[PDB]
Amino acid sequence: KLDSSVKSEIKRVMNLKSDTGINTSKKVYLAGGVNSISKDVENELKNMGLKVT
Amino acid sequence: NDTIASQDTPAKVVIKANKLKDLKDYVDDLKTYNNTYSNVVTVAGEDRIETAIELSSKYYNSDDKNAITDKAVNDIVLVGSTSIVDGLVASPLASEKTAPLLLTSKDKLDSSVKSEIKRVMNLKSDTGINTSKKVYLAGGVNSISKDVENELKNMGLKVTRLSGEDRYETSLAIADEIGLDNDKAFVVGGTGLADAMSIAPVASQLKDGDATPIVVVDGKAKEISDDAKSFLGTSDVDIIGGKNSVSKEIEESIDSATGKTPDRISGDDRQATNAEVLKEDDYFTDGEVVNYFVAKDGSTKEDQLVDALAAAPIAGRFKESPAPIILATDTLSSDQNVAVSKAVPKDGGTNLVQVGKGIASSVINKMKDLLDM
Amino acid sequence: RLSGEDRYETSLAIADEIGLDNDKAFVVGGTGLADAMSIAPVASQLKDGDATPIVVVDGKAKEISDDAKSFLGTSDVDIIGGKNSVSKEIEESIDSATGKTPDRISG
Amino acid sequence: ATTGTQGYTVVKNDWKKAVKQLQDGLKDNSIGKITVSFNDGVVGEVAPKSANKKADRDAAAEKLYNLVNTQLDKLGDGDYVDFSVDYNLENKIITNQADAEAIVTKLNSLNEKTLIDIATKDTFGMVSKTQDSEGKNVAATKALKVKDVATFGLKSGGSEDTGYVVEMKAGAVEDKYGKVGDSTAGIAINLPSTGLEYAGKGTTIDFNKTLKVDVTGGSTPSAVAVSGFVTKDDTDLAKSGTINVRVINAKEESIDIDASSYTSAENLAKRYVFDPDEISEAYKAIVALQNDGIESNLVQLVNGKYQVIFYPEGKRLE
Amino acid sequence: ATTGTQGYTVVKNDWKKAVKQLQDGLKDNSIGKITVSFNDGVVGEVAPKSANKKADRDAAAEKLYNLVNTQLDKLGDGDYVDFSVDYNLENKIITNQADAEAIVTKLNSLNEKTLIDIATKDTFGMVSKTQDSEGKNVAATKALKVKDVATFGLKSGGSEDTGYVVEMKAGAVEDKYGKVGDSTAGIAINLPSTGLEYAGKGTTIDFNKTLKVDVTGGSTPSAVAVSGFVTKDDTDLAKSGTINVRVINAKEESIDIDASSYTSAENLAKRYVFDPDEISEAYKAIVALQNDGIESNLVQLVNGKYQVIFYPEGKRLE
């Protein structure tokens, strides 16, 4: 589970908002496989509207 | 037959139609839904103390769009979390001193409040404490104990207490600190808690730079105090609340002292008086008030008006269009419904700030309806 | 390997490799096996070097996939098979996506 | 190219057909020069050495494709290719004899359109050159259709170099304009003296303005004229100038309002955030076109449908 | 430009370094023009508008990178980029004051290298300008080193536009060449009068040929000379002309025979099929170089190692 503290820092540091378009330049790099960062967490980042590599 | 799109665009949307009118309508709806997807904030914590902290963190030493100040502050206004009576006229003080209005438990300074004080004033070991770093305690010892005052002093801050034996002397102590420099002042009755909260945003309007002071007077006395008379000098006064809050006797008294005829903004109850504050032209312009705050009215319990106390400075300084506070716990009055309707432009409101938790959803929905949100 | 989770994604993988360069494409239903075989020779007809791609779509769905829409772009489409293989809903979907009226060859 | 300017925005999947339109533009001579830019920086100029020669135009078209094909085929997120296209729609010709004949048939499909009806005692129309023995106008034999006024076909000196050019030849009309039984002599019909060639002139034949009658005088007519080929710019930009083409790494969302299922303007707002000025300018151009007849590049008649283009900022959160 | 020609073959992973060298080459004016080709077709020309201006050379280098960066970074299997590089190593200047000083340090690191040793009764070498009281040559104080024949540093008047240019100034030597105790007068040491400028002039200083002694006459020497800057090109190619660089979508297999683990010639044959003529021509040039002293463009001394280059046809079956 993406920690709520981490989700908040992601939105804060990248400035993600409802009134603003998430253009193709907002990117999140997951450094590790599924046993380090699960699929559930990757999908939560995708669900907010970010490119996730 | 096209424009050059941004490189970061996720799509090329081509909207086609046989009839130019069907196109016109699709593009009109698109414009409408695009613009509308954005505007209603709540500011509340699990406690009234946390609500005040949430307000301080959002509006003082904050980068927020409606913040009163963006830099570290030199002044705090502190109020006893239970004692609304003592801190009653502290909102315009907080407004003019560019200071958050915080709530504290009487006996122990709350750790959350202590953290917010250090944060909002930026207190440090490498920096000299000149005679200007200040904490104003709005209230006597039965609202904010000596223990708490000494704890603020222990942090290394100058602590000034604006107080007296009662709400009246306490109010003048606070009003004296605000200063009466625009030849204008507000007056409210001792039991007019909600009335003081209704006018608090207005008093908190910096008008020609200065906030306007609020004075609590013994509304059932024959004359106002010599201290009130001296403070009021030769100024214009606006009385907030009906004859059951501030008698006609007191209005005459103010007239005689100032030499100028005082105004009266009032209704049959607190929600009505709140509505009247909004209707008054000196305080708000018709079809030009877009920003609104909502807080509990105190009907269920009087001390629950502390949310409005802490919100009022902010409402007074909000952007470049001052906001009122609508007092409503479970329901809006008919007068409030009308007032907002006449205050708001035909186009609706642009900001709605709910302050505290126990405001019923009906109230917010109704405010959203009145403001077309 | 040109593949996907199902027949539809697999078909686009194959159609993508063929490339849609003549502004023309073929579409068949998931159960339209025989229909795909009926048009396969035609798709296989080269015009100025290129074959025409065939895409399998969910014939009972409300809309074709975003992948199908993207791949098809603004091209002319010929649907092979009846309403039980590729519903009228899917024909409309292809029309809306391409902006061009698709044809239907069926029995 | 500069974001927001007048010009075409092609998506990645359609790069080949868009580039084909520029290649056709170079081959057909609509385009005198293409300055190519990868992202924001200029990387090459494509221009035929001599517009008169076919080979030079084909060479320019091949070089264009070779230059941009990997850049376009491998276009990443945020990347784009801009083409600044110096054109002169007046120089566009038809390089294929099959395509020239395809345009001749497009013009011939109008041959039976009646421009002016036969006259009556009540309504003005076509009358004869000479009055009867009593000095009165008698009705003409036939109505005036496009077949009367001009014939179509490819020009005599056509070739792949100079182009096949569909050509209209003004006819001759002995018949005039008037009322039957009237003593005043019929008014002479001015036939097309300009716009006699259509080389596919960086344009498409505007059938609303092409071969259209312009009666002058209202209730009491004094002059009648018929236009030659009047074209419309495939982009609304002027018959000479510079247009920007831009390919981007975006998906094409075709929204046909006449369709049964299309993305509702509501769900479109829910999926993407749009530039308010991009919307309001398109809306103003629609209102102006609807109310005053004022044309704009933002809204255009393309394939019997009015179209607008939107490039949203990005997707909406959640 | 053409498979099999003399020139460089860069693999995809090193495209950035190779393009940087061409960019540096445009910036330092080694390169007057780069004609770029995507696969077999020419797509652009990179050339500074005016060689004397820095900005025009930087613009040429940025255009070069912008043009080729996607094509190279996204290079697919079977794709390639060819650069035809018009250069004139003689126009190379050193356009960065940091790079010019890097070459001055290169030259200064030679200063202590002995060119001629001190003479002895047994051996010819350096002797004094004037003979002793008995009319015999006496040994010189010190050996002849490079510090004694020339000084290094960047030329005055330099700027990024005109360039910094590393410069040699011939020194002065009073000492001569002979044997100690010999009556014949010492021979004058001829100092560098040419090849005095070096901006890294699209070439690298050949230290085997630069600042080298040439004794003439034998048992009775009659002349001694010292060369100035004698260069060897970044390439084996002449001081000026045209070079072909090609980037390809291949993995680089560095086969160092001096290594502990390298691909045995057996396993190399097992993994790939090699052109027999590519092998035998390389082998013949190795044999000629080994048995006779003969140098060849097929076999070259590069970074202290003899190199051959192979581009196999493909992988072997099984």
Instruction: Give me the DSSP letters along B165-215.
Output: SSHHHHHHHHHHHH---SSEEEEEETT-HHHHHHHHHHHTS-BTTB---EE
Is the minimum CB–CB distance between C87 and chain D shorter than 8 Å? Answer: no
Contact E257, E307 (CB under 8 A): no
Chain E (141-180) residues lying within 8 Å, Cβ to Cβ, of chain D: none
Is the minimum CB–CB distance between A15 and chain B shorter than 8 Å? Answer: no
Distances (CA, A) of B252 to B95, B207, B249, B262, C64: 30, 26, 5, 9, 80
Residue C35: which residues within 8 A CB-CB, separation 6 or more?
Answer: C28, C29, C80, C81, C85, C106
Contact B104, B51 (CB under 8 A): no
A39: Cα within 13 Å, side-chain hemisphere: 0
One-letter amino acid for residue C47 of the chain: K
**Among partner residues A18, A19, A24, which is closest to B10 by beta-carbon distance?**
A24
Is the minimum CB–CB distance between B14 and chain D shorter than 8 Å? Answer: yes
Nearest Cα residue to B342 out of B372, B365, B370, B363: B370
Residue D168: which residues within 8 A CB-CB, separation 6 or more?
Answer: D107, D150, D151, D152, D192, D195, D196, D197, D198, D228, D229
Tokens of D149: 């006024």
Q: Report the C-alpha gap between E158 and E94 in whole angstroms.
A: 9
Tokens of D118: 């036969």
Distances (CA, A) of D299 to B62, D233, D287, D302, D307: 45, 13, 10, 9, 6
Looking at residue D117, what DSSP letter applies? P
Q: Report the C-alpha gap between B326 and B194 in whole angstroms.
A: 10
Start-to-end Cα distance in chain D: 33
Is the minimum CB–CB distance between B9 and chain A shorter than 8 Å? Answer: yes
Chain B (20-39) residues lying within 8 Å, Cβ to Cβ, of chain D: 20-24, 26-37
Chain D partners within 8 Å of E76 (Cβ): 70, 74
Count Cβ atoms within 10 A of the Cβ of residue D162 and give its class: 0-12 exposed, 13-18 middle, 19 or more buried: middle
Residues in chain E: 318
Is the minimum CB–CB distance between E41 and chain D shorter than 8 Å? Answer: yes
Q: Between chain E and chain B, are at least 3 CB pairs below 8 A?
A: no
CB atoms within 10 A of CB C48: 6
Residues in chain C: 107
Q: Report the C-alpha gap between D240 and D203 in whole angstroms.
A: 11
Residue whose entry in the numeric block shows the structure tokens 């094509």? E71
One-letter amino acid for residue E23 of the chain: Q
What stretches of chain C adopt beta strand conformation (E)?
24-29, 54-57, 76-80, 103-105
Nearest Cα residue to B367 out of B292, B309, B284: B292
Question: Are C99 and D254 inside 8 Å of each other by CB?
Answer: yes
Q: Which chains touch A (3 or more CB pairs under 8 A)?
A: B, D
Q: Report the C-alpha gap between B246 and B238 in whole angstroms.
A: 11
Contact E210, E192 (CB under 8 A): no
Q: Which residues of B236-253 are buried (b: 16+ CB within 10 A; e: fewer)?
A: bbbbbbbbebbbeebbeb
Nearest Cα residue to B91 out of B314, B352, B354: B314
Q: Report the C-alpha gap between B301 and B194 in whole angstroms.
A: 11
B264: helix, strand or coil: strand
Nearest Cα residue to B301 out of B144, B138, B90, B85: B85
| Torsion sign over Cα B140, B142, B145, B146 | positive
| Beta-strand pair E166-170/E150-154 | antiparallel
Q: Report the C-alpha gap between B368 and B348 in whole angstroms.
A: 9
Chain A partners within 8 Å of D318 (Cβ): 18, 47-49
| Torsion sign over Cα B283, B285, B290, B295 | positive
Nearest Cα residue to B229 out of B273, B274, B271, B260: B260
Q: Report the C-alpha gap between E34 and E25 in whole angstroms.
A: 10
Shortest distance between the Cα of A24 and any Cα of chain B, in A, equals 5
Q: Between chain A and chain C, are at least 3 CB pairs below 8 A?
A: no
Shortest distance between the Cα of A18 and any Cα of chain D, in A, equals 5
Is the minimum CB–CB distance between B37 and chain A shorter than 8 Å? Answer: yes
Looking at residue B298, what DSSP letter applies? S
Q: Which chains touch C (3 or more CB pairs under 8 A)?
A: D
Count Cβ atoms within 10 A of the Cβ of residue D224 and give its class: 0-12 exposed, 13-18 middle, 19 or more buried: buried
Is the minimum CB–CB distance between E211 and chain D shorter than 8 Å? Answer: no
Nearest Cα residue to E119 out of E188, E51, E182: E182
Chain A partners within 8 Å of D77 (Cβ): 24-25, 51
Start-to-end Cα distance in chain B: 36
Count Cβ atoms within 10 A of the Cβ of residue D227 and give its class: 0-12 exposed, 13-18 middle, 19 or more buried: middle
Long-range contacts of B336-342, Cβ-Cβ distance < 8 Å, separation of 24 or more: B336/B271, B336/B274, B336/B275, B336/B278, B337/B366, B337/B370, B338/B275, B339/B274, B339/B275, B339/B276, B339/B278, B339/B279, B340/B278, B340/B292, B340/B367, B340/B370, B340/B371, B341/B370, B342/B279, B342/B286
| Torsion sign over Cα E3, E8, E11, E15 | negative
Residue of D nearest to A18 (CA): D317
Tokens of E54: 């820095």
Chain D partners within 8 Å of E69 (Cβ): 38
Contact B7, D312 (CB under 8 A): no
Q: Report the C-alpha gap between E228 and E196 in whole angstroms.
A: 6
In sequence order, what are the beta bridge partners of B288? none
Is the minimum CB–CB distance between A24 and chain B shorter than 8 Å? Answer: yes
Runs of H (alpha helix) within E178-275: 265-271
Chain A partners within 8 Å of D317 (Cβ): 16-18, 20, 22, 48-49
Tokens of D274: 């749009």
Residue whose entry in the numeric block shows the structure tokens 């405010």? B367
Mutate to test the interface with D, among B16, B28, B32 (most CBs of D within 10 A): B16
**Among partner residues D77, D78, D273, which is closest to A21 by beta-carbon distance?**
D273
Residue B284: which residues within 8 A CB-CB, separation 6 or more?
Answer: B202, B277, B278, B322, B324, B343
Residue numbers followed by a gap, chain B, C–N over 2.5 Å: none
CB atoms within 10 A of CB A51: 15
Tokens of E232: 């060897």
Nearest Cα residue to C93 out of D253, D259, D45: D259
Contact B103, B143 (CB under 8 A): no
Tokens of C57: 């779509």
| Backbone phi, psi, residue E215, to 5° | -85, 135
Phi-psi label, residue D109: left if phi above 0, alpha if psi -120 to 50, beta otherwise: alpha
Chain A partners within 8 Å of B38 (Cβ): 18-19
Start-to-end Cα distance in chain E: 34
In sequence order, what are the beta bridge partners of C76? C24
Residue E296: which residues within 8 A CB-CB, separation 6 or more?
Answer: E285, E288, E289
Chain C (48-67) residues lying within 8 Å, Cβ to Cβ, of chain D: 62-63, 66
Q: Which chains touch D (3 or more CB pairs under 8 A)?
A: A, B, C, E
- Please state how this structure was obtained: electron diffraction
Is the minimum CB–CB distance between E70 and chain D shorter than 8 Å? Answer: yes
Shortest distance between the Cα of D69 and any Cα of chain E, in A, equals 9
Contact B123, B157 (CB under 8 A): yes
Q: Which chains touch B (3 or more CB pairs under 8 A)?
A: A, D
Long-range contacts of A41-49, Cβ-Cβ distance < 8 Å, separation of 24 or more: A41/A1, A41/A2, A44/A1, A44/A2, A44/A7, A45/A2, A45/A10, A47/D318, A48/A7, A48/A10, A48/A11, A48/A16, A48/A22, A48/D317, A48/D318, A49/A16, A49/A22, A49/D314, A49/D315, A49/D316, A49/D317, A49/D318
Tokens of B347: 């186009």
Q: Which residues of B77-96 are buried (b: 16+ CB within 10 A; e: fewer)?
A: bbbbbebbbbbbbbbbbbbb
Shortest distance between the Cα of B330 and any Cα of chain A, in A, equals 29
Tokens of B304: 């629950």
One-letter amino acid for residue E12 of the chain: K
Contact D83, D246 (CB under 8 A): yes
Residue whose entry in the numeric block shows the structure tokens 């010709």? D93
| Torsion sign over Cα E271, E273, E274, E280 | positive
Contact D235, B1 (CB under 8 A): yes
Q: Which chains touch E (3 or more CB pairs under 8 A)?
A: D
**Among partner residues B9, B23, B26, which is closest to D311 by beta-carbon distance?**
B9
**Among partner residues C70, C92, C99, which is closest to D13 by beta-carbon distance?**
C70
